[PDB]
Design an enzyme around this catalytic site. Structure first.
Site, PDB file in Angstrom:
ATOM      1  N   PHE A 181      -4.550  -0.398  11.326  1.00 37.60           N
ATOM      2  CA  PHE A 181      -4.829   0.019   9.967  1.00 37.60           C
ATOM      3  C   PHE A 181      -5.923   1.061   9.964  1.00 37.60           C
ATOM      4  O   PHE A 181      -6.967   0.878  10.601  1.00 37.60           O
ATOM      5  CB  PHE A 181      -5.295  -1.176   9.150  1.00 37.60           C
ATOM      6  CG  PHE A 181      -5.560  -0.886   7.721  1.00 37.60           C
ATOM      7  CD1 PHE A 181      -4.537  -0.748   6.801  1.00 37.60           C
ATOM      8  CD2 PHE A 181      -6.853  -0.594   7.343  1.00 37.60           C
ATOM      9  CE1 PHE A 181      -4.831  -0.317   5.517  1.00 37.60           C
ATOM     10  CE2 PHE A 181      -7.125  -0.259   6.057  1.00 37.60           C
ATOM     11  CZ  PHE A 181      -6.128  -0.162   5.145  1.00 37.60           C
ATOM     12  N   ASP A 233       8.929  14.364  11.736  1.00 39.49           N
ATOM     13  CA  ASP A 233       8.658  14.246  10.280  1.00 39.49           C
ATOM     14  C   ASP A 233       7.165  14.223   9.979  1.00 39.49           C
ATOM     15  O   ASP A 233       6.716  13.428   9.154  1.00 39.49           O
ATOM     16  CB  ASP A 233       9.327  13.045   9.618  1.00 39.49           C
ATOM     17  CG  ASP A 233       9.311  13.146   8.068  1.00 39.49           C
ATOM     18  OD1 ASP A 233       9.222  14.269   7.478  1.00 39.49           O
ATOM     19  OD2 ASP A 233       9.344  12.100   7.431  1.00 39.49           O
ATOM     20  N   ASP A 247      -5.428   8.488   4.318  1.00 38.82           N
ATOM     21  CA  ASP A 247      -4.518   9.501   4.871  1.00 38.82           C
ATOM     22  C   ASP A 247      -4.982  10.892   4.459  1.00 38.82           C
ATOM     23  O   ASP A 247      -5.839  11.072   3.572  1.00 38.82           O
ATOM     24  CB  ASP A 247      -3.076   9.230   4.492  1.00 38.82           C
ATOM     25  CG  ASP A 247      -2.740   9.449   3.049  1.00 38.82           C
ATOM     26  OD1 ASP A 247      -2.975  10.479   2.537  1.00 38.82           O
ATOM     27  OD2 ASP A 247      -2.287   8.472   2.434  1.00 38.82           O
ATOM     28  N   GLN A 287       0.758  12.619   4.724  1.00 36.85           N
ATOM     29  CA  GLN A 287       0.743  11.170   4.483  1.00 36.85           C
ATOM     30  C   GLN A 287       0.840  10.401   5.797  1.00 36.85           C
ATOM     31  O   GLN A 287       0.440   9.215   5.780  1.00 36.85           O
ATOM     32  CB  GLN A 287       1.884  10.801   3.534  1.00 36.85           C
ATOM     33  CG  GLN A 287       1.599  11.152   2.091  1.00 36.85           C
ATOM     34  CD  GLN A 287       2.871  11.019   1.287  1.00 36.85           C
ATOM     35  OE1 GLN A 287       3.897  11.625   1.612  1.00 36.85           O
ATOM     36  NE2 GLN A 287       2.825  10.197   0.249  1.00 36.85           N
ATOM     37  N   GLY A 310       7.177   3.984   2.227  1.00 40.92           N
ATOM     38  CA  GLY A 310       7.172   4.831   3.434  1.00 40.92           C
ATOM     39  C   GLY A 310       8.560   5.414   3.666  1.00 40.92           C
ATOM     40  O   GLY A 310       9.465   5.132   2.854  1.00 40.92           O
ATOM     41  N   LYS A 341       3.706  14.949   8.279  1.00 42.52           N
ATOM     42  CA  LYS A 341       3.283  15.352   6.945  1.00 42.52           C
ATOM     43  C   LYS A 341       1.912  14.750   6.716  1.00 42.52           C
ATOM     44  O   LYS A 341       1.560  13.819   7.413  1.00 42.52           O
ATOM     45  CB  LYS A 341       4.312  14.941   5.888  1.00 42.52           C
ATOM     46  CG  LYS A 341       4.388  13.471   5.606  1.00 42.52           C
ATOM     47  CD  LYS A 341       5.456  13.225   4.617  1.00 42.52           C
ATOM     48  CE  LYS A 341       6.306  12.055   5.005  1.00 42.52           C
ATOM     49  NZ  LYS A 341       6.970  12.286   6.309  1.00 42.52           N
ATOM     50  N   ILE A 357       0.853  -1.226   0.000  1.00 42.06           N
ATOM     51  CA  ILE A 357       0.000   0.000   0.000  1.00 42.06           C
ATOM     52  C   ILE A 357       0.874   1.256   0.000  1.00 42.06           C
ATOM     53  O   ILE A 357       0.293   2.343   0.142  1.00 42.06           O
ATOM     54  CB  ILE A 357      -1.026   0.005   1.154  1.00 42.06           C
ATOM     55  CG1 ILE A 357      -0.386  -0.036   2.548  1.00 42.06           C
ATOM     56  CG2 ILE A 357      -2.022  -1.123   0.947  1.00 42.06           C
ATOM     57  CD1 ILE A 357      -1.385   0.118   3.685  1.00 42.06           C
ATOM     58  N   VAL A 387       8.958  -0.354   2.685  1.00 43.63           N
ATOM     59  CA  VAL A 387       7.601  -0.708   2.145  1.00 43.63           C
ATOM     60  C   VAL A 387       6.534  -0.825   3.267  1.00 43.63           C
ATOM     61  O   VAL A 387       6.782  -1.408   4.337  1.00 43.63           O
ATOM     62  CB  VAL A 387       7.684  -1.991   1.302  1.00 43.63           C
ATOM     63  CG1 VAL A 387       8.186  -3.197   2.093  1.00 43.63           C
ATOM     64  CG2 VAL A 387       6.375  -2.303   0.609  1.00 43.63           C
ATOM     65  N   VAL A 388       5.336  -0.297   3.038  1.00 43.98           N
ATOM     66  CA  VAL A 388       4.156  -0.518   3.933  1.00 43.98           C
ATOM     67  C   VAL A 388       3.136  -1.401   3.206  1.00 43.98           C
ATOM     68  O   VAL A 388       2.787  -1.087   2.047  1.00 43.98           O
ATOM     69  CB  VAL A 388       3.523   0.834   4.326  1.00 43.98           C
ATOM     70  CG1 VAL A 388       2.330   0.601   5.261  1.00 43.98           C
ATOM     71  CG2 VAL A 388       4.541   1.792   4.964  1.00 43.98           C
TER      72      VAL A 388
END
Ligand SMILES: O=c1cc(Br)cc[nH]1
Length: 287
Positions: free
Chosen positions: A76, A121, A80, A125, A13, A123, A10, A17-18
């Site tokens: 989960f 950090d 976002d 997302q 990141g 943001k 999905i 990877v996520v």
């Protein structure tokens, strides 16, 4: 693989990877983050974050260190804020929902900051939303634990002290990032969309004015400060974030002070007059 029944990419990141994954034993769907390389100093520090539970923080369910690979298991959420702002671009996010989200995000930061955990950090997302009207911050505490990360690493929400090379962080870095996100929710356009460190710093200076020792005592001694920076005048917030009202413009001002020490705290921001009429609306969420 061994402990997951089904796994689906999905996104890329910050650290790796996520995946959306289903736990084999329980059937629950989780976000599984593979950390791209394990340093023993990072495993204990991040494991402590399993205890750091709040309604506005994405729950770190598990830290899985197996086969010399590190995975973080999180609760989960279906969307976002980056995607939700894109989906909401024709209309904008309604003001009561902006206010709700900002209030909730401040509650999450106040909680983490009170436990001496920074994000560093933030943001859009990493701000996750659900159908119930909640918003939650993901990835608190990871930057300190992991250090320098191994796609583009968005600079748009970075506080000026970090752009000026300070290798010290404080709670104020997160307030800065959240102020930038607040402005973007209101205007439908990133506040400071830099595409290099100097462009980021100069976009800030062109809006807020070039900082000096009057507004930011100590700035001219920052590691990457240059006396040759151009001197731009500061714009009024009325031009920057219309049609935000004077309470909203007054709160944003306090989140975007140059000197980190002058920036409002998350706890004080919750008391700002902007939130006198805060509510918790239901979002229009297309999944
Ligand atoms: O950091 C700053 C600079 C000015 Br000028 C006004 C408020 N905050």
């Amino acid at each position: 693989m061994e402990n997951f029944q089904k796994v689906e990419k999905i996104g890329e990141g910050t650290y790796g990877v996520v995946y959306k994954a289903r736990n084999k034993l329980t059937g629950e769907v989780v976000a599984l983050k593979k950390i791209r390389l394990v340093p023993s100093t990072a495993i204990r520090e991040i494991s402590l974050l399993k205890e750091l539970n709040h309604p506005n923080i994405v729950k770190l369910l598990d830290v899985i260190h197996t086969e010399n690979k590190l995975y973080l298991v999180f609760e989960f959420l279906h969307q976002d804020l980056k995607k939700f702002m894109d989906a909401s671009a024709l209309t904008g996010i309604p003001l009561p929902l902006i206010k709700s989200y900002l209030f909730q995000l401040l509650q999450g930061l106040a909680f983490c900051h009170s436990h001496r955990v920074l994000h560093r950090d933030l943001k859009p997302q990493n701000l996750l939303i659900n159908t119930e009207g909640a918003i939650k911050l993901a990835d608190f505490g990871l930057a300190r634990a992991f250090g320098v990360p191994v796609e583009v690493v968005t600079l748009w929400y970075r506080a000026p002290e970090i752009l000026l090379g300070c290798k010290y962080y404080s709670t104020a870095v997160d307030i800065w990032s959240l102020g930038c996100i607040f402005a973007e929710m209101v205007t439908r356009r990133a506040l400071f969309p830099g595409d290099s460190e100097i462009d980021q710093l100069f976009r800030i200076f062109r809006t807020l004015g070039t900082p000096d020792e009057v507004v930011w005592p100590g700035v001219t001694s920052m590691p990457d400060y240059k006396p040759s920076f151009p001197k731009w005048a500061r714009q009024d917030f009325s031009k920057v974030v219309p049609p935000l009202d004077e309470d909203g413009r007054s709160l944003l001002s306090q989140m975007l002070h140059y000197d980190p020490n002058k920036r409002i705290s998350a706890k004080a921001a919750l008391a700002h007059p902007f939130f006198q009429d805060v509510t918790k609306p239901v979002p229009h969420l297309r999944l």
